[PDB]
Amino acid sequence: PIVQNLQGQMVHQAISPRTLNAWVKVVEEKAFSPEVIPMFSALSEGATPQDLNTMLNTVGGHQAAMQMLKETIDEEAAEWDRLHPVHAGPIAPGQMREPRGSDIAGTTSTLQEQIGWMTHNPPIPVGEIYKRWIILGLNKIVRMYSPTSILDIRQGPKEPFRDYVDRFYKTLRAEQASQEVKNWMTETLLVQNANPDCKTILKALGPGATLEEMMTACQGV
Amino acid sequence: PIVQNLQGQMVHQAISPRTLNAWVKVVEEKAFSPEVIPMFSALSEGATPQDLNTMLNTVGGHQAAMQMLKETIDEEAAEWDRLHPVHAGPIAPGQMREPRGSDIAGTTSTLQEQIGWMTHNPPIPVGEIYKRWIILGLNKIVRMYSPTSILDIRQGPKEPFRDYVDRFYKTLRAEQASQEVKNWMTETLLVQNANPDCKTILKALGPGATLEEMMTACQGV
Amino acid sequence: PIVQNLQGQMVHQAISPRTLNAWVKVVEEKAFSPEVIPMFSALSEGATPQDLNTMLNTVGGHQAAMQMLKETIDEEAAEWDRLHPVHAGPIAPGQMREPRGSDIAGTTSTLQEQIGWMTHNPPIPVGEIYKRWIILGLNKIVRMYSPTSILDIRQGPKEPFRDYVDRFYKTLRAEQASQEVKNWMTETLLVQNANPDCKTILKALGPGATLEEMMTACQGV
Amino acid sequence: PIVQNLQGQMVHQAISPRTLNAWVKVVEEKAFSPEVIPMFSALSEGATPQDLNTMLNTVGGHQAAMQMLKETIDEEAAEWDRLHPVHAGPIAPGQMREPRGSDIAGTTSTLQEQIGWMTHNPPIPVGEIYKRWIILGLNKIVRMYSPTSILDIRQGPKEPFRDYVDRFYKTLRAEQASQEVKNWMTETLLVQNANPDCKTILKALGPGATLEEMMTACQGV
Amino acid sequence: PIVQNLQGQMVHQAISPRTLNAWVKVVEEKAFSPEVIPMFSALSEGATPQDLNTMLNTVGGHQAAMQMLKETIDEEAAEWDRLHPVHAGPIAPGQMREPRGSDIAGTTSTLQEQIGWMTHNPPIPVGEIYKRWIILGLNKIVRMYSPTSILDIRQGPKEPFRDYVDRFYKTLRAEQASQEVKNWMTETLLVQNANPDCKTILKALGPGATLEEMMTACQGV
Amino acid sequence: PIVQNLQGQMVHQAISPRTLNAWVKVVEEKAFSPEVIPMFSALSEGATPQDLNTMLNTVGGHQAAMQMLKETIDEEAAEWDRLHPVHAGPIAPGQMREPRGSDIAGTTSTLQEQIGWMTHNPPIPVGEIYKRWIILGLNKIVRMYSPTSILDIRQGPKEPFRDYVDRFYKTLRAEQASQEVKNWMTETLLVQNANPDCKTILKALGPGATLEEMMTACQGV
Ligand SMILES: Cc1[nH]c2ccccc2c1CC(=O)N[C@@H](Cc1ccccc1)C(=O)N(C)c1ccccc1
Ligand SMILES: Cc1[nH]c2ccccc2c1CC(=O)N[C@@H](Cc1ccccc1)C(=O)N(C)c1ccccc1
Ligand SMILES: Cc1[nH]c2ccccc2c1CC(=O)N[C@@H](Cc1ccccc1)C(=O)N(C)c1ccccc1
Ligand SMILES: Cc1[nH]c2ccccc2c1CC(=O)N[C@@H](Cc1ccccc1)C(=O)N(C)c1ccccc1
Ligand SMILES: Cc1[nH]c2ccccc2c1CC(=O)N[C@@H](Cc1ccccc1)C(=O)N(C)c1ccccc1
Ligand SMILES: Cc1[nH]c2ccccc2c1CC(=O)N[C@@H](Cc1ccccc1)C(=O)N(C)c1ccccc1
DSSP states (O other), rough: OOOOOOOOOEEEEOOOOOHHOOOOOOOOHHOOOOTHOOOOOOOTTTTTHHHHHHEEEEEEEESHHHHHHHHHHHHHHHHHHHSSSSOOOOTTTTOOOOOOOHHHTTOOOHHHHHHHHHSSSSOOOOOHHHHHHHHHHHHHHHHTTTSSOGGGGOTTOOOOOHHHHHHHHHHHHHHHOHHHHHHHHHHHHTTTSHHHHHHHHHHHTTTTTHHHHHHHHHHTO | OEEEEEEEEHEEEEEEEEHHHHHHHHHHHHTTTTTTHHHHHHTTTTTOOHHHHHHEEEESHHHHOOOOOOHHHHHHHHHHHHOOOOOOSOOOOOOOOOOOOHHHTTTTTOHHHHHHHSSSSSOOOEEEEEHHHHHHHHHHHOOOOOSSSSGGGGOOOOOHHHHHHHHHHHHTSSSSSOOHHHHHHHOOOOOOOSSSHHHHHHHHHHHOOOHHHHHHHHTTO | OOOOOOOOOOSOOOOHHHHHHHHHHHHHHTTOTTTTTHHHHHHHOOOOOOOOOOHHHOOOOOHHHHHHHHHHHHHHHHHHHSSSSOOSSSOOOTOOOOOHHHHTTTTTTHHHHHHHHHSSOOOHHHHHHHHHHHHHHHHHHHHHHOSSSSGOOOOOOOHHHHHHHHHHHHHHTTSSHHHHHHHHHHHTTTTTTHHHHHHHHHHHTTTHHHHHHHEEEEEEH | OEEOOSSEEEEEEEOHHHHHHHHHHHHHTTTTTTTTHHHHHHHHTTTTHHHHHHHTOOOOHHHHHHHHHHHHHHHHHHHHHSSOOOOOOOTTOOOOOOOOOOHTTTTTTOEEEEEETSSSSSOOHHHHHHHHHHHHHHHHHHHTTSSSSSGOOOOTTTOOOHHHHHHHHHHHHOOOOHHHHHHHHHHHHTTTTOOOHHHHHHHHHOOTOOHHHHHHHHHHH | OOEEESOEEEOOOOOOOHHHHHHHHHHHHHOOOTHHHHHHHHHHHOOOTHHHHHHHHHHOOOHHHHHHHHHHHHHHHHHHHHHHHOSSSSSOOOOOOOOOHHHHHHHHHHHHHHHHHHSSSSOHHHHHHHHHHHHHHHHHHHHHHHOOGGGGGGTTOOOOOHHOOOHHHHHHTSSSHHHHHHHHHHHHHTTTOOOOOHHHHHHHHHOOOOOOHHHHHHTTT | OEEOOOSSSSSEEEHHHHHHHHHHHHHHHTTTTTTHHHHHHHHTTTTOOHHHHHHHTOOOOOOHHHHHHHHHHHHHHHHHHSSSOOOSSOTTOOOOOOOOOOHHTTTOHHHHHHHHHHSSSOOOHHHHHHHHHHHHHHHHHHHHHHSSOOOOOOOOOTOOOHHHHHHHHHHHHTSSHHHHHHHHHHHHTTTTSSSSHHHHHHHHHHOOOOHHHHHHHHHTT
């Protein structure tokens, strides 16, 4: 991450061992379950692209995912370059160059250049921009390693409603969908794919009911 | 959370890895037992809505609960909007907008906007307001995942009184009730649902006795 | 707890995750053995009543005890109110009210009010006053969950003296007694309830002997 | 590592116990898998050559590797000496000497000399230079303890594509290759060495496809 | 422990949870082996008598020892009182009283009084004085729970010399003895109680030999 | 260790619980393997002789070693005294005495005296001098508890070369030898004591080959 030093200057903070071990443990234990993302985001708050790279490099295994991640990073780095053309020429002495997509991703930029941009007034938030891309890739990975689709989730004959909902929202959390699509999957699927005895009750509760109500209503069978 | 920096400015504090791992462990180990709430409250002291969101996002599983939580958040966000109408128009340059319910819940607001409100003089405590709502939802969850009601708690024939009381107060802690309702459940149920041998003794101690006294009095059988 | 900020002002310190997890572990592992009290006292040093409440709320189980604890808190809160009558009227604008027993216990007081009192010049140490009450209740709990009395502790025929003493002082630590009563239990019981072979020796050492001496003297049989 | 003290002066920071234990655990658990490198780099940020030496010295076992490491360090130290000839003579009183390769590697230099160079204006970044060499050696070790070559990686008849890719990129991460060579191994091998059923599909997707697409396309068989 | 605050004043530092848990673990795991003492001393550096009391109170079990500890504390507190008579009278308003033995042991003194003495110019180091007494008691305990005497340590027929020495110095570390007595036990016992084959060799090495030499000399049989 | 306080003065830093527990764990788990030394050195950076003593005192067991350690300390303390004669006389009021060997080892010196010397301008680095001696003893211990000599290390008929080298360098790390002696053991033994099939190959590589090359060359059999 980054802080201002004793005096005026602005210095890099080494990522702690705890922050590191935590990120590695998350991944060993949770693979690419959705909750990994928040965790990465949390553990990376204030990060430079180096740091972010570091963090990603500390994962062993999941290299298929990691390659998808790079391709997503790449995809975005191109789009950045296209929206912000740079001017290759005489870079005015000790004066800051404009970052390219590769400079944001850390491949063509130093830590010192990175800090430089991040603490500029006004700042170029290269860490956050790189972070946004990384999370994009992380979503994709999450979808890809979701073993089931929302359409394959039906309540079991003898499955309490609470657990169907659990499985449904869990599955739903791991989908490619805008918010509007998830909403739609909910409105269409949740009641439809409930089992017969509970489905009848819920049809009767009508479309304005809360989940608390739905669960209450299917409690007794 | 939030602190004032080296100099005048007011900066975000990343939630630590310990605070994170602790919240995740709590939930893996305790599901939605009542004590989870304090723990969440403690681990979240000083939090911005982002942070709170982060914390909630780091839980995998319990997605039925988490959906109830959102609906409760939503319910409250509406009520806020209704009690505080905002004026959509020209937001005066670099000047702070009034938060909506969605801005409090973090969905339509940035961290920078959030800090802004939290450290304003006089402040809009958006973290505490969002926290209050989240705890509301957390109570509801707690009730919903309580597998037994206070009325189903009777002392076993051969159950020491100490343990009946344990089960009764534990059950009672997980109920929807104002303080006045819990009091009432106590005054009506605790002695009534004690087993015969202990019940006689307690009727004889009379209604002003403490629990220490009650336990003392049923010690010997 | 509480500290003075960067500048002049006096701010709340969130109780750490370590302090929290430690208190929870203590109780899971030790129930209400005497040593729990020091531990609570240590983990709570500098605490506001909120914090103390937090800590107590984080224990799941032991709810019979916790109810005794509240009754003891209540008992004390009444006594406080009786010794310090407050004047209900126009609370002079932004000026500090006198705390009631409920304000000390945290039920009718905010954190901000609490800090206010704790850092007043001269201060009202509401945390320490609430702490003293809580420890009182904690003693009572300790006595109540002590499964044996000092009078039931006799040295086994083939029990080395060292271990009898261990059991005796352990039992003695968990009693309701002033210091003078414990002293008395010692002077009357320890030698009397030793087994015959060791008892004879100790009668011969006479009443001024130390425990080191007593143990030395019963070493050889 | 290094920080500026209370006042003007610039002082050494002891490497923490956590940073140490973490590095030792990494190696016990992961031997010389690629991810070890980032970890070492992370745990060593800001390090003086002493510290780096310390860290390396704390590994027991892997002494064949460690000897390769020294030889690589040595190789580099020579190259440094050759590119930067020093002038042996009267070292001007309390004035800084130019570092040799051995002074960078820590063998002929003190901590005080090391700090001196690192915080000079303009600085001689001896820690980073030594770090770069150490990582070079660490790469070599990584290659040497890679038990399989990229050419020996073929998808199993009944191996989902996802896992072949995993094994391929993992193997590829542990190779001696410029970026251009890895690219080349990819373009030549990945599709070629896929199993027949998946290979046909991928030939049909054509050379511009992403891995996400490739995995999508071989999903269904 | 104790530190000077933000501004001029001198404030108490709560003993950390780590320092606490560490002391409790030491004792659960090591009982009263000699090394416990250093550990206690280390964990208690800078402590007030409250803190020290706290630490001692956090041990459950070993109550026979703990009672010996109090008697030793008591013994010393008396001796202090006798060497430093106090003058009971009008304690000059807000002016510091002279500590008694009970004030040093914490029983008749507050934390505020304790800090007061510890940071006085010139200081009364009540923590160190109480610490010295506590360690005295701790030595005694150590001796008392040493199950074997230095005279009972003979090298086994087939016991390598290294291990005899280990057992001998370990036993010797747990004895009541001035330095001069330990020296004497060494000079008299170590060689004498070695087994015949090794004893002959050592007699021949003569009285100026080091242990390194002794071990070298008995290596080969 | 040591730091300058809030204001001008220079104060002792208690060794942390983590630094302590870490040193104890190292030794329980690793006995006197070579890597223990770095670890001790790392964990002790900035230490006063008290602290160092503390650390050594916290090890239980290994008392034969610890006695060798003292003798080595003693040996060195004598040599110091002989090279720096002190003048016993009127020690000029509140003025610093010259340290003896016993004052460096901590036996005749206080912490306050120790800090005094360490922070003097110009300083007497008593911690580093004592540390150097302790490490000397630690080397000796390491040699003594090395169960095998470099001459007894031959490659197994069916032992990959990598593992022979591992065993050889590991053994070599635990020897009494100047750098020049180790070099010599290498040049003479490593190839000579390799097994026949690998030995022939290595003779053919010639004396300038690296270990990387040697391992490469014996890879294939
Ligand atoms: C955890 C989760 N499950 C989902 C299933 C489908 C789609 C999204 C999700 C999410 C992420 C998810 O939406 N998380 C919430 C935070 C949150 C988590 C858990 C309970 C309540 C609030 C979030 O990030 N935001 C901004 C948010 C905050 C309030 C209301 C709605 C959204
Ligand atoms: C822990 C608990 N069990 C209950 C059962 C029924 C209703 C509520 C509860 C509670 C929460 C509960 O009431 N917790 C207490 C704190 C507390 C916890 C444990 C012992 C003593 C004090 C609390 O939050 N407040 C403000 C409080 C403080 C003093 C007296 C009464 C209330
Ligand atoms: C630990 C313990 N066991 C008891 C048995 C009967 C009554 C009380 C106790 C106690 C608490 C107990 O008395 N603890 C001691 C601290 C202590 C603990 C252990 C050894 C020495 C000193 C204490 O709090 N104080 C103020 C104290 C200090 C010195 C002398 C006497 C009392
Ligand atoms: C982790 C990994 N696997 C490889 C296989 C072949 C070659 C190299 C590697 C690497 C290291 C690897 O390339 N790591 C990445 C960081 C990274 C790791 C994981 C996912 C995305 C980005 C890196 O260090 N840099 C500078 C980088 C950043 C963005 C794009 C490309 C490279
Ligand atoms: C650890 C130990 N074992 C003993 C056996 C008999 C008597 C005493 C002991 C001790 C304590 C013991 O003497 N510990 C040493 C520290 C120490 C520990 C281990 C190795 C070297 C130095 C100590 O405290 N001091 C002041 C000391 C320092 C140098 C030389 C001699 C004494
Ligand atoms: C770890 C080790 N194994 C040995 C075997 C024989 C003799 C010595 C050793 C050592 C200690 C050893 O030499 N450690 C190295 C640090 C080190 C450790 C591991 C790999 C590379 C560099 C060291 O302390 N120094 C000053 C050093 C630094 C660079 C080159 C040569 C020496």
